[PDB]
Amino acid sequence: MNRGALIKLVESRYVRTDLPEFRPGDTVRVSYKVKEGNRTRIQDFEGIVIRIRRNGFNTTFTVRKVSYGVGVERIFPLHSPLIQKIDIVQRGRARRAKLYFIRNLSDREIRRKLRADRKRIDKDRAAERAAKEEVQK
């Protein structure tokens, strides 16, 4: 009975590792399996990461964006079977965890407040185009 953990982790066979890295302070777009009137589609959602709530399974994350004058946020179950493809577009400096403070000043300052994490930027573009040539030959 000393498996209180693993037990919860057994039904947790709904896991998914087809999902890149992304720490708060970097914009990212996700194609969600959104059902239209009756059919199914993949409405793209393009925004920055605000919250990341880690709790083993069901560990969700939030994404807020500007839309025609209004700001809209969305919380996504990380290992949700409806996250077709979560694509990274640009990473930046964190210096925070839950950065709701962007709500306050969502302007050209929010850009100079959220820098460009050249650290991960390099590691990303490099490891990408570097391991590509390896998978080639």
């Binding site: 969700t60 025609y68 004058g69 209004v70 809209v72 946020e73 969305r74 919380i75 996504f76 949700s80």
Partner: protein, 122 residues
Amino acid sequence: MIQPQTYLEVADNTGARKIMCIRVLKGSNAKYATVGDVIVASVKEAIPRGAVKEGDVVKAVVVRTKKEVKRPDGSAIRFDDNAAVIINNQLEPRGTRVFGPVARELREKGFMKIVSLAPEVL
């Protein structure tokens, strides 16, 4: 959540700008109202010589809430502010072009007339 005495913005061009919820139209004694619901409200201000003037008691349907809406598929979505659209007893917008995103919930309520004019059907 939207209750009486609540100020909502106007996502359409009905001329209205801000309206205070007079009441939530639902069960005998509702308590709140979120995206998709319809509420009796009063215009607390409107564009000069608009289609609807200050003090007009109209019925409107929520389009955006500050309180995130839960999705059956575990998903969640929250807006920056609370707004709606002045409707007809025919449950159709008194105005046309309705700028500003909406919600997919409006779809299961028969307000497709809205969603068609709503650019960002999020």
